Every structure is written in structure tokens, then in C-alpha cells.
Design a protein around this ligand. Structure first.
Ligand SMILES: OC[C@H]1O[C@H](O)[C@H](O)[C@@H](O)[C@@H]1O
Ligand SMILES: OC[C@H]1O[C@H](O)[C@H](O)[C@@H](O)[C@@H]1O
Ligand SMILES: OC[C@H]1O[C@H](O)[C@H](O)[C@@H](O)[C@@H]1O
Ligand SMILES: [Cl-]
Lengths: 394, 394, 394
């Protein structure tokens, strides 16, 4: 059954203190995957859940606070030995781009719910300044004008690599898509990874509604952690107040949806994707706006057997089997269901959960699912699917 | 039919680059009229739509950023010749008071929807600092204590000249109404139009819920324009955060409505007018509050054939034919319908539109309408009625 | 009948310019009682209503702005003689702890509704800086890190002395409950009432959702008073913006309720009390969240004859007759009904009122009521019950 088999997936993908995202992969750790995965481990071993994230920060984070989307461990890792600072160690290679910052929301959960309160305090106090340094890096590097919104400089940073929202922005990248993904990374290295220059010169510069909604939720949860731990919340309050203005600005009244914005073109990207629901998870809309989203989600359910497709099924870009261009994803079902529940849309949240769980019962733990047939696609033994099966049924 | 005849009205009232508010009038340009009118021109000629507003700013705006409610052109105007700065030109007389600042909301629309993206960028980048200087003037002159709310010092500044809300405040103006309107203007000139002295000494000093709701919506839209154009949003964020506190303060829980405030008396003005619905257009209430407004609007619909009367039909001040003391206005129907739609009140928004359109089909394009009989009143070939007929049916 | 008998209670408990909370008590004045009581006096004598609060501030408030929960008058007081500063007078003993700051909300009501506008202005201008100094003391003493949330250092400060929420926090206080209440006060005196040391060292340190919701409502109302009186709102705006973030942080999504937080343990206190409804009175939730509260209140109504019990009737701590551990309280019914009404929950607000009024018709004016039988309990001729009977039926 679901939970036992989900544990088996997590154990098979474990490399000591981190979990690979899927069967077959090299021993590398991914940023947002590890955050969702840690939620899974809470249903198995609380220390192991904490260790997932200690490992991400301990081996991943730079002196400027940046958290990379991949840590290239190339080996298994032991648990954090504690204050670490008194022996020499190896620092692995990492990527030079980031991913959606759901981590603070996870750490708040682990802190609040760990039945071992001494451990909870020790781990949260250790992680708190590291989280704070990561949010700080995001704002300082990616919102240097203090707009309240951060930019992504590479489509991979959205976590939604080939979202049809990125098609037009990607098309302007001078050197079919892989060539443009690689050209961006070549530009960043050519610019010595200088945040000021790359923000100035990147030919891809997008305010991603997903990344921002996730960051705003995380800001709220980081604030709560700061108050509970009696840490100073000064910087976090600023991000919250600006971010509330920023995220709501992305609502397009004529479309009745939230859009990502293309700052190179200076235009909203008029493509409705599952990311546009994520401000519900941030908690920024008013109820009328949430109700218009609920109506939209139900309309998508008129054309797809399983919610929530990654793009509007009536979009000319909708393709039922192609990664972020139509298929259902377990992590996004979970965030969006959480958001709908928060706004009182209990039946719609329940449907999102029931569809996620049915897909995993039928097909096992896969990366994404065809919304028309329910066919499992992509990676096998896909860790965040397994982890969220465990968490959602706790 | 409606749209062709609406175009004819706009063309007949055109004076090159600006549009007079109605048939028969001198070649003068009005501030809020021109903003609504520009929306109309989008259905005819996008450049002409932009030119309406370029003309308002180019001939209207002072070195301190102030936009006057009237620019006394006394002649037709040519399109903006571009960087203008290298030849001498004439600067017309203007009024010394302002009007509701809906302009930034219009400019955002023109920017986002112009099919010519090069033109959109050129025009919006040109107008952005001018808009910003106007909002700045409003706050610095009319909210010197940084409350988040601006005062009007003359009833005309509300755009709702004889609203029954102004009766008591107007009655204290030392020298029947025209005498008091003129005395205010004499005071302002006597004080050399010094904003600091006039704020201190004006015997008429009102926080108008309409003006403020319109300004708050415009602040939100100016923020979006700043982010899209990669302009610095620093000042605008301050106005938004303070303005959200300010506008919501105007809600009176016992009345279940938003009231303008009389700062000379230090009291809410307990008169329910159509302006009290406008915080929906600003997007500040929560849904419960929006629902109480929807209930009120429906209650007004029990006594008036056509929504939305400018005053509660059960008010002792309600008069079905007298300007802002009862009659229906197309611009306010439009803003309020927009607001209700945003809060999910689709049927009520639809009714507001259907009533506005029926009145214009039956009576043509008039300034205001009797809510009991539907009789057209006031100006003929009334431009914002024609313009919003075009915009609302786009 | 209710109103005449309520007046009789207030008159019998009057000691000149202040009202004792109940029949039989020494001539002492209580902070939150006097605020609710002043609302009662508006239905009898407006000057007497103002005098209640003038007396509280004039004899109660320190040079640092602190308002104590008890002023130990030991005698009756004459009305405020006006600018007071030119003769010597007696300054009574006061307690060294505070109570929920509902006062600014009351003063706003008295200001707006006094039919004597000259008196209203004189009294409100006199009280405004004193209110402002009290809110300032609260934030500076009890939120020295500028979180937006204040702590209580003694359970009595919540006004909900034996709320089951305080059980675990109280249990850590080194020296059955009275011994721990007294030990806290001994600590404070040992620390010379130094706010910095007591915040640092108190073994009881709780973010009370009730106190904070009441303070946030009061901040909003103090802002409105500042704007109406043309006072400077600078400090108040800061408290409002931070407080909106703080109060919403207390929502627990898994429980669907607002919890107080224990800052010594660093944990939410997972006990659902009537205080958790009070953010409705502050106006901070969105409607979805208000709807989840309405659902919870209705669920409590499935097990209790009378709403609103002070603790969830299904709580293991629920006891129908024991002070704040189950019984119905008139003041909390009133605040929560006010809040529900604001969010459009008209039937639920009406039920709260109908239950409060039925209990007082049947049992007279008592401190609290058994939610299962309706039996009156605690003090007799309980002033805030009488006062809110008068106010709620005005
Ligand atoms: O599984 C690791 C990564 O694989 C793919 O790139 C997914 O689109 C991305 O969201 C995920 O984080
Ligand atoms: O048409 C120009 C002006 O005419 C009247 O004064 C209207 O009340 C005002 O709103 C409008 O802007
Ligand atoms: O009546 C005076 C006081 O008595 C009790 O301590 C109540 O619990 C408290 O809320 C009240 O303020
Ligand atoms: Cl809401």
C-alpha cells in the first residue's frame, strides 16, 4: 500500500543525510525536492527529516547566503556532527542558480511538530540564521530595487523548467531550448557570477508568480519562527510588507488570473499555468479573488480527468504528457490544495488530494501524470511524490 | 447603434489631441474626463488615446507636479512632437485645483494593451515620472502629516460637485452655493496658492472617500507600471501601505458603509453616496465588507429602477434629477461594477453594466440619468459616457 | 426589565467618576471593566461615560504611559475639574501589571457619537495623547524587538485569569495557582519593575491572542481618532502594519484556529479558547479564515446550549462553571459578535447577542454563565454585563 511503498522509495533514494529525487540518479541533492522530501521523512524518522535540510545548508550554502538548486555531492553524507568547525572537510561543487524557496515553510513545520522539543529548538536555532541569509540573498541579488518581487534569471529556477510561460522570454536568449539554457549559464560564468551584472545583463529576467508566491509564504513562516525563537524579525517584516504588494500586483483582472511578468519585454506573460494558483498558498488574495481562482480550477476540471494540470487544458500550449506543459504534479497539487483549504474551498482541496492519491495508488510514485489518462510519466521512484503521499496522509 | 454613435461623439468633441467633455463647450480639457475618454479612444486609434493624456500632462502639469482639473487651452492642440524642449511654445492658463487621479490606472491599461509595444514603452516611460510627480504633489500638498489620506479643499475636487456629503462642510465657508465655491477660490489666491497655508487655513477640508479610493487604485497601478518598466517604486510603496490603512479607516461599522470625513468638524460625514462604493475599485475591503456593500447596493435597487444612484434613494437628500444628488452616472457605474466583479459579485457587476448600457441606448450619451425614469440629463454628447460605452463593450 | 435594571446596577456600583466591577467590592477601578462600562453609561449620561475614562487615566497612568489593571482608589472620585495641575492632589496606589487595551476603541465611539460636539472634541483631545502613551508603553515594554506582537508577563494581564491556555506556562513558574500568581508579582518587585529585566527574566511570557487582537483593534481606532483630530499618526501606523503581520501569524492552519504563543517554551499553545475568535474584532483575517472560525463557533454550539463558551466544549479542560474554563462571558460575546457581523456572519452575530441577552434576562447581571444550564455565576450586579446589555440594545 501507499505509505509503506512510499517509505521504500525514500529509503532506496537515501544517500545518508540527503535523498536523491528519483530512482537511477547520481548522488546529487536538489533544493526544492529536499524540502518536500523532509516532510515525508517526518512520517519515518524526525532526525532524518532534519538531517535532509541540515545537509542541504551545510554542504550547499555560500558565504553570501545563496542556496543552489543542486549540490553535487558525488557520495553519501553522514549526519551533521554538531559544532563541524574544528576539522577540515570537503565542500562539494554546486550549481550557480537557485530554486523555489519552500524551505522555511518546511522548517517551521519541523520545528512546531517535532515531539522532541529539545531537538526542535537546537535544529531550528541552527537553521534560522541560514534561512534568513538565504532570503536575504534572494532579495539583495534578485530584487536590488526593493520592489518586493524577485526575478529568476534562468527558467530552471522556477522549478517548472519548460513551463509554456517561459517560451517567449527564452526565445530572446542569444545562442533548441537546451542551447538557450546553456547559453544563459555561459553568460553567468562569463560575468563571474556577479549578481549586479547578471541582474543588469541577463537576457532572461522574469518575475515568476510561483517562485514569488512560495517565497512570500516562506517569509510569513520565517517570521513566525523568528517570533517563536525570540530572534529579531526586522528584515523579514520588510520582505513581508513589500511582498504582499508585489504578489498581488501580478493579478490580471481582465484574465481573472495571476501571471508571471517578463521584465525584459516589460509585459505580463499572458499564459495561465498551475503556478498562478500559488498565491493562495502565500495567503495574499482576498476571498473574491480566491473564488475566481476556484472557478477557474473547476473550469480546468471540465476538460481534464485529474486536477491540477500544469497548464490550462484549453491553452494552445497544453500537451498532456510533456513535463510542465499540461501534466499533473504532486507537489503543486499539494501546495494549491493547502491554499484552497485556507480560503474555505474544502471540496476543491479534497479533490486535489483525492486526485493526487489516486494517481499514486494506480501508477506508483512518478514525476508527473497525464491529466487525461492518468498515465505516470518521467522519473521512477520519484521522491517528492512519495514524500507528499506520506505527509498528506499523516 | 451604440459604438458607432459613441465614436461620432468623441470625434465631434475632439480638439486635436484633447477631447472636450460635452457638446457645446469651449475648447478646455478636464482631468478626470480625459482619463475616461482615453479609454474610449482605445477602440478607435491607440495613438489618439495616448495623445489625450500626453496633452493633459504636457500643457497641464506644473513644476511641482500638480495636475489641474481644467486646462484652459482656448484652441485645438497638435500631437506631442516628441523630445518639444527646443522651440518656444505657449503654456495655457489652468485651474488651481485638482480632480480624482484615475489617470495612472488608465495609463497602465494603455501600456499593457497597446498592440504596438515600442509605442507603449515610449509613451509609458515618458508619462511614468509625470504620474509619479502628480501622486507626489497630492501626498505632499494634501497629506502633509503622512496619514495615508489626502484632503480636498474644494467640493469640485471630488468630481462630485454638489454631492449631499459636502452640504454641511460647504455651509461653514464664509462669504447660494456658487458664492461659497467662489469664496474658496478667492481664499486660495489670497494665500498665493501656498499649499502649506491653504491646508492650514481652508474652511473646507474633507477626506473624500471617492478621491481617496481612486488614488489608492491608481497607486496600485502606478506600482505595477514601475515594476514592469524597471523604475524605482520606493515612493509608491509608501503611499500604498499608508493608503491601505487610511481608506479602510473610513468604514463605519454601525452604518455598514464608507463615509467621507470632515476634518474641519473632525467628524465622519454620515451621508451614503455612490462614492462610498469606490473602495471596491481600490481593492481594500475584505470580502465580508464587500458583501455588506453588495447588500446595500441591492437595497438601493429596491427603490431605483436603474443602478447606481449617486445617493441612497431613501436619503432625505435624494433628488432624482439633480447632478450628484441622486442621478446615475456612467463613470461611477463602471468603476463600481469593476470593483464588484473583482470581489466575485458577478451578477451585481453585470446589472450595473446592463443599466448603464440601456440608459445610453435609450437616451444617448448624457451626463447623468434619472434613476426612477431613466431620463437623460445634463450635458449632451457627453464624452465619458460615450467613451465608457466603447470601453465597456470592447 | 433589562435596561432599567442595568442602569440600577451601574448607579449602585458608581463611586462618583468610576464604577466598581460588581456588587460588594472595595472602591477600586479596573482597566478593561471601566472601558466596557463607559459604553453602558452612554445610555444614561454622556459626561458620566467620559468621566469613567478620564478617572482611569487621571489617577491610573504613570509618566511612562503605563495603565495598570487596578487603580486602588479607596474612595469615591469627583469629576475631572479641568486644567488639575494647579492644586496638590492624592495619587492612589495602582497594580504593577496591565490588562487588555480596549480603551481606544471605546474612546473613538464616545468621540464619534457624543451629541455634544464641543465636549467630544475637548475630551478626545485630552485623552488622545494619553492613549497614545499607553499603546507606546505596551509596545516599548512588551515588544522591545518590534515584532508587532506584545507579551503578557502574568496570566491576569489577559483578563482571562485561569484560561486553560495558561496552564502549562503557569506550571513553569518557580514558587496552587495563587502561589504562582504571587511569585510572579514578587519577581517583578524584586526586579524594581524594570521592563527590560522583567521581559528578559519573567518565567511567564506569552503572546496572548486576545490581548493582541484587542490591541490591534484599538490601534486601528486610535489611528482613526488621530486623523479626525488632525493629530500626528506616525507611531500608530507602525504598530498597525507590524500588528497585522503579527496577529495573522497566530493562525494555526492544521487546527483551523488562532492560538496564543508561549515564548518561554517557544511553542504555540494548542488550546482553543474564546480569545482565538477575537482577531475577527481586530479585522485581520481574510473571509475564508473568518468562515473557518464561523464553522468552529457553530460546532461549539452543537455541544453548548449558550454561545460562546470560553473554551471548546470538547476540550479536556472544559468545565461549565469555572470562570474562564468553559463559561460564557458577556464582554467576549459582544466583541466576537461585533467581529462576526463585520465579516458578514449576521446570523451567528445575532445568536451571540440573543444568547447574551437571554442569559441576562433570566439570571440578571452576573460575571459568567454556565453554557449548558445557563446558570449565572461569579460576581453579582456585574457591571460590564449590565453595561453591555445597555450598549448592545441601544
Ligand atoms: O527532480 C529534480 C528537478 O527535476 C526537474 O528539473 C523538475 O522540473 C524540477 O522541479 C526538480 O526540482
Ligand atoms: O465634465 C466636466 C466636469 O463637469 C462637472 O463639473 C462634473 O460634475 C465633473 O465630474 C466633470 O469632471
Ligand atoms: O472584574 C474585574 C476582573 O475580575 C476578574 O479578574 C476577571 O477575570 C477580569 O477579566 C476582570 O477584569
Ligand atoms: Cl477577504
Amino acid at each position: 500500500p501507499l505509505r509503506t511503498k512510499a517509505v521504500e522509495v525514500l529509503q532506496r533514494n537515501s544517500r545518508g543525510a540527503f535523498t536523491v529525487p528519483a530512482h537511477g540518479l547520481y548522488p546529487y541533492q536538489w533544493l526544492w525536492d529536499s524540502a518536500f522530501i523532509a516532510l515525508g521523512w517526518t512520517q519515518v524518522d524526525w532526525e532524518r527529516a532534519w538531517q535532509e535540510l541540515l545537509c542541504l545548508f551545510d554542504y550547499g550554502q555560500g558565504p553570501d547566503g545563496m542556496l543552489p538548486h543542486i549540490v553535487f555531492h558525488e557520495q553519501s553524507r553522514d549526519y551533521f556532527p554538531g559544532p563541524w568547525g574544528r576539522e577540515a572537510r570537503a565542500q562539494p561543487a554546486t550549481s550557480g542558480i537557485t530554486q523555489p524557496p519552500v524551505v522555511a515553510t518546511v522548517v517551521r513545520y519541523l520545528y512546531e511538530k517535532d515531539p522532541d522539543r529539545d531537538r526542535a529548538r537546537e535544529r531550528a536555532r541552527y537553521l534560522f540564521p541560514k534561512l534568513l541569509a538565504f532570503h536575504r540573498w534572494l532579495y539583495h541579488a534578485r530584487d536590488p530595487y526593493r520592489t518586493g518581487l524577485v526575478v529568476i534569471v534562468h527558467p530552471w529556477e522556477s522549478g517548472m523548467d519548460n513551463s509554456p510561460a517561459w517560451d517567449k522570454p527564452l526565445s530572446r536568449v542569444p545562442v533548441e531550448d537546451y542551447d538557450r539554457y546553456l547559453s544563459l549559464l555561459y553568460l553567468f560564468r562569463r560575468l563571474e557570477y556577479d549578481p549586479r551584472e547578471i541582474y543588469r545583463q541577463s537576457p532572461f529576467k522574469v518575475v515568476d508568480v510561483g517562485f514569488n508566491a512560495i517565497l512570500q509564504r516562506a517569509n510569513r513562516d520565517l517570521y513566525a519562527l523568528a517570533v517563536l525563537l525570540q530572534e529579531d524579525p526586522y528584515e523579514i517584516e520588510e520582505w513581508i510588507v513589500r511582498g504582499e504588494v508585489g504578489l498581488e500586483a501580478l493579478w490580471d483582472r481582465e484574465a481573472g488570473f495571476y501571471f508571471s511578468w517578463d521584465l525584459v519585454a516589460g509585459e505580463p506573460i499572458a499564459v495561465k499555468t498551475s503556478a498562478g494558483f500559488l498565491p493562495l498558498f502565500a495567503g495574499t488574495p482576498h476571498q473574491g479573488r480566491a473564488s475566481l481562482l476556484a472557478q477557474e480550477a473547476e473550469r480546468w476540471g471540465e476538460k481534464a480527468r485529474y486536477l491540477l494540470p500544469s497548464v490550462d487544458p484549453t491553452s494552445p500550449f497544453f500537451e498532456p504528457g510533456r513535463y510542465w506543459r499540461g501534466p499533473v504534479w504532486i507537489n503543486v497539487n499539494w501546495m494549491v490544495a493547502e491554499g484552497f483549504r485556507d480560503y474555505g474551498f474544502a471540496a476543491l482541496a479534497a479533490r486535489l488530494k483525492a486526485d493526487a492519491l489516486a494517481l499514486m495508488e494506480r501508477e506508483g510514485f512518478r514525476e508527473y501524470y497525464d491529466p487525461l489518462t492518468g498515465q505516470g510519466r518521467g522519473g521512477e521512484g520519484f521522491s517528492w511524490s512519495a514524500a507528499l503521499a506520506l505527509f498528506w496522509t499523516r
